Design a binder for this molecule. Structure first.
Ligand SMILES: *[C@@H]1O[C@H](CO)[C@@H](O[C@@H]2O[C@H](CO)[C@@H](O)[C@H](O)[C@H]2NC(C)=O)[C@H](O)[C@H]1NC(C)=O
Ligand SMILES: *[C@@H]1O[C@H](CO)[C@@H](O[C@@H]2O[C@H](CO)[C@@H](O)[C@H](O)[C@H]2NC(C)=O)[C@H](O)[C@H]1NC(C)=O
Lengths: 23, 23
């Protein structure tokens, strides 16, 4: 519904931090 | 690069909570 949106990736500070530790 | 800064420790609400549970 928006005009002019572009693709990208938004970095999530929690995901790698809590995936490296939990393993 | 700052004048007047002082030492201290900033408490992180996530670290102890996710370290006690994950163990
Ligand atoms: C990146 O942006 C493009 C267009 O801005 C998207 O391309 C279309 O996306 C829809 C929905 O996913 C598809 O139905 C179309 O077939 C796509 N067209 C083309 C030419 O690719 C695209 O989805 C966006 N994301 C990625 C990962 O490419
Ligand atoms: C606490 O603050 C003091 C000064 O405000 C810091 O002391 C200097 O720190 C630098 C970099 O760590 C060192 O190269 C100097 O040798 C230190 N000087 C002295 C007299 O200690 C100190 O680093 C800060 N942090 C701690 C944990 O003390």
């Amino acid at each position: 519904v928006v005009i002019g949106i572009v693709n990208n990736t938004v970095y999530d500070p929690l995901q790698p931090e809590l995936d490296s530790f939990k393993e």
